[model samples]
Target: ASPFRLASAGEISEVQGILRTAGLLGPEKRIAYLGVLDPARGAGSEAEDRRFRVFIHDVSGARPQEVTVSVTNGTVISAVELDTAATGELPVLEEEFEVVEQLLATDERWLKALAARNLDVSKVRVAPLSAGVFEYAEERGRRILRGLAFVQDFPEDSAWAHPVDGLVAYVDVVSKEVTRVIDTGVFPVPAEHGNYTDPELTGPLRTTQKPISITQPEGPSFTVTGGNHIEWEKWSLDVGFDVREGVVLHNIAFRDGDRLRPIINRASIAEMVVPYGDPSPIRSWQNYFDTGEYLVGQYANSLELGCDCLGDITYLSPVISDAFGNPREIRNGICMHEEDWGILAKHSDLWSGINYTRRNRRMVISFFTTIGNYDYGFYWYLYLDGTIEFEAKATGVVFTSAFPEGGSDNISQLAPGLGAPFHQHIFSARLDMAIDGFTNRVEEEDVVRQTMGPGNERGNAFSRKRTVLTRESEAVREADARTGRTWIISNPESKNRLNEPVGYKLHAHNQPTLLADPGSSIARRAAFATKDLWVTRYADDERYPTGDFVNQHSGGAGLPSYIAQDRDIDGQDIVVWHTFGLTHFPRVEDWPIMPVDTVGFKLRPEGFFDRSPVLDVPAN
Candidate 1:
């Protein structure tokens, strides 16, 4: 028997009545269904079969609490509020209701006056408005009077005299009257949100935490100089490197322009080619044997002949806080060229977009694409405080048996008629870094140690405790062991695999055969390995061959097989910085030239900011 059941129609009607009476329902509210569950049927009831969980918000205000109601029975299951007033719930309701009532009362007068001024009242009507969690709607028949009253109280001469500020009124659908008005008193201006806060520091107590600046040389190009250039007057540092063939460099810079325009791009310096070979057993099983070769060939072609078009310039700075508490920034600047772009597009299904957050002090340079046989993407986050984090998402589309079908220990390999040994695969990569100059080895050790134990100290305590934790007494000893290791080697696999500790790694798709090649050496040195704790399988029971790659897992897997080979190399020496720059890609819908994509990066200080003994000083 199912654990859920449908609700009666009467139950739904009663709930609707409650919402209507509470002024929650009206034409102006846009409610979107999120999910639904019913206990009467089995726990695995379909979303369409169960009640609905909806998210409702006023387009003019912060998104409201998600309202969960059973569509089958119409019962009010729950209402989860987001950013409710700090004041008590009742006061919040009273304040919002008062504004709704006033708006309703004045709407009729406003409509009549507008009509007298040669405006049409036939397009207006009264409807419900959201004030926090409380719902409000003007009386159905009273919309006309409400409009007239508004005009009487708010004449053209006193347009600014209304009690409510930033109020925007709209007409109702059924009554054709000015029935809805948003009270902006509770909503801050779009730019005032936390995400868009100024990046500059001010006031008398100015500490050393002010933003660092970088300046470029006067000429279009400079020699391959190796040195940290500092504009001492501006407290800025510029680190330069050479762009050589067969090298992949990940560089992050921070700066304060007139605005924050962070750009992300990926480019390929070498052409990619796939050698013909027998398809892996995994690929052959999923009927994707042909796709594997096709993908490799396509990627190679893209690297050899495809247009090296720059990616979109996502704005990373000058972030905006919208009414719904959603912070958005234009993240542009990073670019992927040729084979790299094709590889990303093929593996990730290519959902390219910007990710920004003020609270986290991190901005990401990212790429997403799918190759049908597999999907992959890369992400790099540069923190305001000079820390860098790298991650990757990868999923396998092929499936193969764990053991022979008729093996003696079939139970060990395959349970009951589950068919071939099918398992969904997922992996993640991450790189945690801090400025060598600003950070102490002891402090870094302590932070890493603290994150590897019981409770929430380190690593994933719930599922990875065994993989990440050791006896408490070993913490200090392990900290000592990690003192000299680079950031990537801090969590060595042999020591932490038992606790299933997750880490990060540098990613590369293909490498060329070369000896005594500086570019190859630098490329090899630029790869690092790390772990991701927040990753989870998309669906444990099912294997999806051609779905949204991200759906197979929430987080990334370690570097792909092709990239993992170079994990032993040190990344710092490959100092060549690659910035994805471009004008804009034209879309068919764009009648005019597309707007310039926003982009830029900052050169913040790091712990290893000035430690290289082989610093290449440029001749002035």
Candidate 2:
């Protein structure tokens, strides 16, 4: 049979046109291909080499359409319909979504307002990012309506969104209309409990108030001595008030002592009061709180001046409510080395040889000293007053538990009995405090008793305490429920009585030095001799005032004498001293410039927190 068919030239041209319309011929920018299947080549398999290809141009400006073409034979297949206005290159439908205009207008108004206040508004930009419908209950009943358009900046690029920046506009879904525009700049700081409404100035506002004592001593002067050093002091300030319970209040800590002298001199004489001129989205109050303008005292290497440091000092204080409700005040304290002592004694002077020790009524700060280093002693204390109380101490050196297998010593996973080699390191002590008004002494006793059982174990004990800290009767219940298990309460109290003693321990270990160096042999020998002595007490007991713990068994089968070692150097024993205590409370003015009238104490370091069973876990 003849494969050729007789046809007019015009008829052949018409057939080509039909094939083109069916996508047998490609469009402007796109490319397409098809394959043919033969009936006899197995089931649905191809025996003949049949294929088709087509290319199209970039016709993005035109409406896109889907077309199918036959591959078995060169023929027209099918055509598709497309809406040019919906998919093609069309002008943005800004007019259809008038909400965009309202957002732009609101942004412009805020920008102008900030500019008038001498704030740079150039970086401020706002755009509607998303709109959604939310099913929410109202006074009438369950209502499903288009909620406010949420505007957020691009991820990792916060050039547009900030805490005190941006504007929110309300939109109506049925009419696709913007009903209200709000400038969040004037909105009060977000409150813990309250609707975010009413235009009130938010942050970047300065507040100053009369100084008042926030904490007071509970009992007679308590002596805190253990771990490495010793000290006697009393709580000078302690105030307790709930932020939600109060209507109006302000909390501030002023700097004191040698730390304050420098800042005062710098600010008053050199005119350096303002550390930052304008706030950026990346800059927060925490940054400002750490600057010299807020710091006041110095003890050893620790400078007790800024709010960051103060926030770490522990004490009782009132919680003040604000437009933005901050729930708690955090406090911290440290003993620092004097400049002269630090230079003369090197790193040793920086270590407070003790940890905080607390009995039912007495708190002790203790330290251990090598013979003839008396000039290096000093103390710095901090008191923070806010809804939350934070306490921190400096542990001089960090130690790691060593294993027989070198690779097993890795702490990347915090594997049991695995730690890095010990070194002379310093760590900040941290403890968070909250109210436990409902917890009575008997309940706390039961908790402690349960933890002390032989099989109870410290980890299990700590977990149980954590559960108690987050229980509904505890103050952190709501916060814990909202944020999940991130924030932890370290210490809780029922009234002002002691529930548990909270503090940190210092870790000190020797490093290898040249054999010929002065004091190397003596220091190394001391390190090795004291290696088995894991715990040391600072206060004079009836029998041994300088009570210290030393493992009787020296080597094989028992735990290693030292957490760290320096074998190349002269043999010295590693020493571990532990201490613990609780801060009654101190005022904020005691910081930035510690008053000569103020009094407090700090413990020195002889070992690490891990040396003692009590200091092993974090005080989170």
Candidate 3:
């Protein structure tokens, strides 16, 4: 169980009153508190229930003062404060920029610029422009707040499908002044406006899809206990929701036969990075820690039961706070369901006329979020055979960058003409492994090709070399193709029936590394992607891999900064960090909308059991 509770709607109102009494909240106030949920130190076993630790920022003060409010039993129990927190919170929410955006719509220069292109300002959708993915303006100078505009394709049955390509607007963030525009020239503004309803309409109008049906023959057998806690045959975990990190699973345990063993203490996406390909002033050198820059959870999409999930899905509501601590509850924020994986294992005894088959069972917990042009779907799974999977599905419209106009004779028209450029979607998660017990050790196993030796004269054999990582420094590894490295976290004290350490193996599917030069701006900002895996000694304070503050600045917050001391890690409470991603070069087919692309990793029981745990699983 987590020590802190997310603030409730009633409690937030209580807090708002307290801040108002303290002269922190009002229309005209010198010291104003903006609420961003700040976690409090764990009370350990002092109280049985989770309490609230709310972090509020006073922006109007001479110096930013972060007020810490602690609540126990729906009442404010304590208050402490930190002074001068400039980069202490996520960038102010997108909704908060309405005033600035409205001013741009009325600006004479902005209106004239739209009129010059046969576009009306009334029909234009001015996307709230901030320095996304990269800090080109802030790093150099902050004269303009940049944004891309879309020509509202009215009667377009589907989405806001038309984009006024190549043109970028720079609005003054502070004075709300009409800044100059950077016109990269025009590209195809989509005229086709059919929604995803007509799957048969595949010609010039649009592309569609056919329907498929999937249903469960039997109703759900899994049970939900104590609100957020879940229990299936041998799997159990306390599922909770967070405003910044979305779905989180705490105190996960798996039953190996009759014994319930601890697998992971806590797991969640630490941060995400998307670095653009182009090098132009506004679009180029764009490196974004997507999760940190945009509070990824802020854009959570509300999902319907049957549409977003299937097979008697269970929906969990999350009470979330804005960058300011206004409490808002989202229905169906987390979805849980069980799916049939088809033919888990099968074998035949032909002579005896005996047959056996077992259908794979997987428990899925998922959540979806959108940030600007990209949508990310996070899915965590538990399998009958003692396997856990983390899958991320990437979808949504491609970024309509400045491109050359589309033409038959043009070579690579999409890339040259205002097309979306090359980019990477890298995700890192904090994997707090408890394997069998809280104390665990990791062995980096490498499969090495052998030369002609006494064991084998043929020189065709390979062997495993296990290296026990005694410290955090020795634990960081890049996936090796030649040697084929894999990491295993095991408890040395606990041995299986085979007298081997009971452990789980990290099945990492190797992906691209950050391609930027070490000294490059993007590289310094997102250095966590440089390696595939990292291990660190667990400290309650070390939560987000990108540190807690992600407004803007430099490379000090993420894994690079977390490991600065490189403390002792041998057998102490340890956390595992993995970085993997898909390297993308944009294409014409990816326009309009992108087909869902996915990437992830898995964890399988290594020596945790004497044999396959699913052997007891009955045939369907």
Candidate 4:
């Protein structure tokens, strides 16, 4: 079979026609998502397959049809219309956001609250959010979005700084009515200008910085072959984009002499959750599944060469279908470039008066998306030394709430009245490991201290401990700082020159997972965020950390359900789900627009290579 690639425009339209011909698609129904169906893991599966998955949603009935079609033969393989009340509705559409904004203006209760607060209807910005699951009788099984109002001075002004706290309008999209309006004592809106882009509003721009230019006269070192295939130094992979997950990497392999060895079969940031820490009624219901509830790839930004990307850069335009099943190309949606990483390895000998050093270079593949107030960038770096890293860069305007002067709770007061709340951006990255082949196992490596009476006569004696995680329960674990914990995904069938299994060591920082109460709705829905690591037996259908439909979902899906089978993962084709992100307590400097806060993990080749792969490169 050929390497995995993205769905073409022809396949998208062909699948749409097949669904429409089957009487599954109607004028009221639109394509929620469409993508090439991922093939089964291993060889001898489907060769030259053209199967595509389509999610069609009827907005009138809140009915979502999950259909799979083969574009090769133009036939519907399978189709099912889910009961949204039990499974949750499809993702909110782009037009539905416009409808929510318009619906807020018609609601008398919402308008009265705005009038009482002296907020103009024209200048207000309405953010349509996924109305999380609650035990309310009126909201049961309803397709709705919670409208949070923000006051914008002008149409272009950043309204994040001017949140109208204590007022929320729950509008049902299917019924086209404001279901309920919660008006709990109006709070004062912050009067500061959050617009940092305009020089007139920001007062002045920095002038002390000097210019640093980067130019590759001979062009970039990486080659982007047809079908989004990339080859940089010793690394070779296929880049794919989805409507849900922004950048998906497939067939990640490393060139070793005459052999191209597989490391990861497929990799992607499966899901992300932003859960606020305030217990107050209006602010407490602020948990959002960014990738699941709102498709970030659908909102991917068109990157610029000199700005979003620097140095010699290559860009790939991804074609995604709109709500109406028409192909829309996001120009330059994915960026591929190289960066000088200072040094790969360096050493100086005083006795011999000789020096050995080598400059390092890394191939960076990245994409940025702006989802409401925050912008996020996922960067994948491939180095010359056989190390792969995935970094999540969080930046943009901080989500704020209005508070009384000198008063703060579960928030960091940025200004006298503007308070930025504490939150966690938990990202789940799915790594389908093929360390050397399809069969692999995992081991937990911890630097352990020996007991004084046994191997260690003194406290100075310490050694490394390796434990095989052979079961699903054993693989569901957390990072321990005391032990300096790391996990190793290794191929048992493949061995290096030293008679050790070829492997890649997973390195990560000890970050907290979901901080919500265990019994809370967020904790249940985002069970994937409860642990730092999870190892599940590989399945073609199990992709997302959160279930497929996450909008207003009632928990018990995704990772928790994936591990319920508890299949023995020892030397089996397995998937590693690493939940990693930062728990942000906002800073005062992060008010107007936040600087980039980065968190990621590294997959360093341990026994995968015979020795340092860059040892042969000549010194520059």
TM-score of each: 0.22, 0.16, 0.86, 0.97
Tell me, by lDDT, which candidate is best. Answer: 4
Winner on TM-score between 2 and 3 is 3
Clash totals, every prediction:
113, 105, 9, 0
Ranking 3 against 4 by TM-score, winner: 4
The residue pairs in collision within model 3 are 35-324, 35-325, 133-287, 133-288, 402-418, 403-417, 403-418, 404-417, 404-418
> Model 2, 1-620: lDDT tens per residue?
10111112333334345455554344342221111111121224434422221112123333333343343355645454434222221111112234443443445554464554344444333332222112112211110111122122333322211223223444432234445445434421111211112124233444676554323335323222222122222122212111111101111112222221000000000000111111221111101101011111111122243332221123222221111111222222232211111111112233886444322222311111111101111133321111111122222111112122344222211222222221111111111111121111111111222445677656455432233221112211111221222222121221112334222222212212111123322222123222211221111111110111111111121112222221211111111221112111112322111222311112221111113322222322
Q: Candidate 3: worst 10 consecutive residues by lDDT?
A: 29-38
Tens-digit lDDT track for model 1 on 296-398?
1111111111121232222211121122222223222122211111111112233665432222223334433334324333444444333334444433222
lDDT for each residue of candidate 4 in 1-620, tens digit (9 for 90 to 100): 24376677877788778877988877888888778777765477755667888888887775678988988889999999789878877888888888887998978998899999998998888888888887676776778888888988987888898999888888888889988889888788988887888887677877899988999999988887776888989889999999899999999999999899999989999999999998767777788888998888999999998899988888888999888777889999999999999888888999999899999989999999999889999999999999899999999898888775667668788876888889999999999998889889999999977777766667688889999989887789899978899999999999999999999999987888888889999999999999999999998889898889999888988989889888899999899999998899999888789999999999998888888899887896
Instruction: Give all candidate RMSDs, comma-separated.
Output: 28.6, 32.6, 4.2, 1.6
| Error at 520, model 4, angstroms | 0.6
Best by TM-score: 4
- Count backbone overlaps in model 1: 113
Off by over 4 Å in 1: 1-251, 254-358, 396-620
**The 10-residue segment with the lowest total lDDT in model 4:** 1-10
Ranking by TM-score: 4, 3, 1, 2
How well does candidate 4 score on lDDT at residue 448? 78
> How would you order the candidates by lDDT, starting with the best?
4, 3, 1, 2
